[PDB]
Design a binder for this molecule. Sequence first.
Ligand SMILES: Nc1ncnc2c1ncn2[C@@H]1O[C@H](CSCC[C@H](N)C(=O)O)[C@@H](O)[C@H]1O
Ligand SMILES: Nc1ncnc2c1ncn2[C@@H]1O[C@H](CSCC[C@H](N)C(=O)O)[C@@H](O)[C@H]1O
Lengths: 197, 197
Amino acid sequence: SMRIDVVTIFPAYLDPLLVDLRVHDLRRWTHDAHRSVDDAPYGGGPGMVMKAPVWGEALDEIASAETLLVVPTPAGVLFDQATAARWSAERHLVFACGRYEGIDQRVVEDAARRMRVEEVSIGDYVLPGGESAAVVMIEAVLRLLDGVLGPSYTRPPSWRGLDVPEVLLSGDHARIAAWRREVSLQRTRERRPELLA
Amino acid sequence: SMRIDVVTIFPAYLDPLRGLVDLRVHDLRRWTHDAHRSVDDAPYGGGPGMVMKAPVWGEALDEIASAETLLVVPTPAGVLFDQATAARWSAERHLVFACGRYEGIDQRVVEDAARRMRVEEVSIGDYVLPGGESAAVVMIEAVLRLLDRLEGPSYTRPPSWRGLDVPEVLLSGDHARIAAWRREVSLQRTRERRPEL
Ligand SMILES: Nc1ncnc2c1ncn2[C@@H]1O[C@H](CSCC[C@H](N)C(=O)O)[C@@H](O)[C@H]1O
Ligand SMILES: Nc1ncnc2c1ncn2[C@@H]1O[C@H](CSCC[C@H](N)C(=O)O)[C@@H](O)[C@H]1O
């Protein structure tokens, strides 16, 4: 039903992880003895940029017109639960994992001529590579596929002088739902006030 | 200089991530006391899934953490992790990541730990992961990267590729025009993808 390809210069990074998950070494698409995937940026600046000649060949082999190409980037639109649910209905996801200063922008523009491309950030922080971001996104999608085939407490009722809220022991499904909504609302006001506009 | 302990029921998860930094991974089952080495139990108040037990977690953190520790608890209900947090955590002597699984850790673990250490409940973004291990990887990567509004596009050779040319300004050699162009693309990119910034 779903195929997921991950392209990276660090295939061992996805070892931690109906669904056919494949991980590809980007160096398989290099033609030199040094298996070179990067080169100096135009306009100067530190670091190296991943070459379009290498990425172009990798995507020519792996992706088709039906593919949804995900490019992790700290400059992309934010990944969220609505995106994970939408991507869980896809037949083919491809994750182009960037390293160094990222992939040559023309790779994305060229892919977008035949397939759908989404440049996505997992959050407002900087990772050294796109591998952990692909892992995070694949986990959120796979979690939804597994499911479609507030604070938590368990025993003991009292621990280190801290008791489970009495409402959770009441057996009253309505009062429990009302309490969980109140704690959720209080947490949102304190931690994420922007979610209440 | 910095010690990082990761506590999880999946120690092999952090294998690809591993002298200034001492990174250690602990199997949470080391602090269980039953024959089944069980870390979870049914939730109070009903609901699907299991909850990780406070006795196991309390004992693990009593051994691993001290008053100088900063305990990070991944949770989709936490304050958002960001670059400012990664920079702040890079100055810490001891970070401990309590990786949740199932429906999460019994809330009393955090309240009890906060009696003898600093605790931060942190979300890596507005999506749901099956466990906190990938979230710990993402956070540790952002901190380790530092110890080692939107970004513009990057380009490398060739100057023309599949009919797509590198912007002429990047070939001009004019540091002033290049800086002006990068500021403009950064601004346009932010307007299209993150207008709230
Ligand atoms: N917040 C984020 N979300 C998604 N991918 C990100 C990301 N931050 C970084 N990446 C990934 O990491 C790659 C390199 S970004 C630059 C990191 C490098 N240490 C440096 O100092 O330049 C990007 O191409 C992207 O794939
Ligand atoms: N956005 C996020 N940021 C940080 N940690 C998260 C997270 N989403 C999930 N987690 C981690 O994943 C654990 C389980 S929460 C969700 C999994 C649960 N089996 C379910 O299907 O509801 C949490 O305790 C936390 O450690």
